[PDB]
């Protein structure tokens, strides 16, 4: 054993870092939805026939836990999804679905935005002012800082709406959720972590360097959250800016085809037909960056 003591000799940040190069995607960048039946394994329908019929249609098996002790164990934390026989597209990046009114603004998805429909970045709020932080996040008699509407999804931005009870970890654990499964919505919907992250500028960036990071198992098919100290913590800029990035998607195969025919930079534009649209990606990841090297 050796004792080492380090003391910092700068009165500012004497060190810089940058994400210089990227050389593969660990995930599939797929469209496979999250299987809530694994995440909330305890729930059943009160009627045996409705339950069995819905489980057959959804392709799910009967909730298999040696109820009492193994349920207490799972609510303590458990890794309960088997791997597929073969993987060619790496790790399964599952999609978390937020129900959305069919009249949501399509321009909302064209720029990086909070997917819950109302902005919640605490860097715009006065440090340690939890009253103003809570008002900014939830008060729908106040205009949203980004768009100045109350919301673009009433079922996601309010306190106790469907997606708030679904994806806020404090509501998830009043439900019987399995903690081991990673959830993309958690950073935007854990509003208590967001309130607590509301510090001053330099305290915020120091905390970003230390604690505001992800942990995902690298060897499993599914995204399981790992404990601290077994492998590296994963930086996620979306935890600071509190936004999701728009990926190239379309409603029709025609517009995808014209994107493939197009020149370089075609992926970055978001034209629309009458009822059919494209959202272009905001960074040229898929087109040039991943496949250049």
């Amino acid at each position: 054993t050796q004792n080492i003591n380090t003391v910092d000799m700068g009165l500012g940040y004497t060190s810089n870092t940058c994400v210089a190069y990227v050389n593969r995607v660990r995930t599939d960048m797929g469209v496979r939805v999250q299987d809530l039946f694994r995440v909330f394994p305890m729930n059943v329908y009160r009627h045996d026939e409705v339950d069995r019929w819905i489980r057959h249609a959804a392709g799910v098996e009967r909730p298999q836990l040696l109820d009492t002790e193994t349920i207490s164990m799972l609510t303590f934390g458990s890794m309960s999804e088997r791997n597929a026989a073969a993987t060619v597209h790496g790790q399964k990046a599952a999609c978390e679905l937020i129900l959305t009114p069919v009249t949501m603004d399509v321009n909302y998805f064209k720029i990086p935005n909070n997917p819950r429909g109302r902005a919640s970045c605490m860097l715009a709020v006065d440090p340690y002012d939890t009253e103003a932080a809570t008002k900014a996040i939830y008060d729908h008699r106040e205009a949203d800082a980004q768009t100045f509407a109350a919301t673009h999804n009433p079922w996601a931005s309010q306190a106790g709406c469907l997606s708030d009870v679904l994806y806020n970890t404090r509501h998830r654990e009043r439900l019987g959720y399995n903690s081991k499964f990673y959830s993309p919505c958690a950073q935007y919907f854990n509003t208590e972590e967001i309130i607590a992250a509301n510090k001053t500028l330099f305290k915020t960036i120091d905390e970003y360097l230390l604690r505001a990071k992800d942990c995902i198992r690298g060897d499993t098919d599914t995204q399981y959250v790992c404990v601290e100290g077994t492998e590296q913590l994963i930086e996620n800029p979306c935890r600071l800016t509190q936004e999701a990035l728009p990926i190239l998607s379309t409603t029709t195969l025609a517009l995808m085809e014209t994107k493939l025919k197009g020149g370089a930079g075609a992926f970055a534009t978001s034209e629309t037909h009458f009822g059919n649209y494209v959202v272009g990606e905001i960074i040229p990841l898929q087109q040039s960056m991943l496949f250049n090297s």
Partner: protein, 49 residues
């Protein structure tokens, strides 16, 4: 709680001081673990006990 009065009385090493931002900005946005800011001349350093 730091003994700031000894820091004031003791001899010091004169250094070129470099903060990226304004001193008052990095003090006000809590870059430093411990701070003491005072305005005018504070007599506290004179009463040795």
């Amino acid at each position: 709680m730091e003994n700031w009065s000894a820091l004031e009385l003791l001899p010091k090493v004169g250094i070129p001081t470099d903060f990226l931002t304004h001193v008052k900005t990095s003090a006000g946005e809590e870059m430093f673990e411990a701070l003491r800011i005072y305005y005018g001349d504070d007599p506290e350093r004179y009463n040795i006990h």
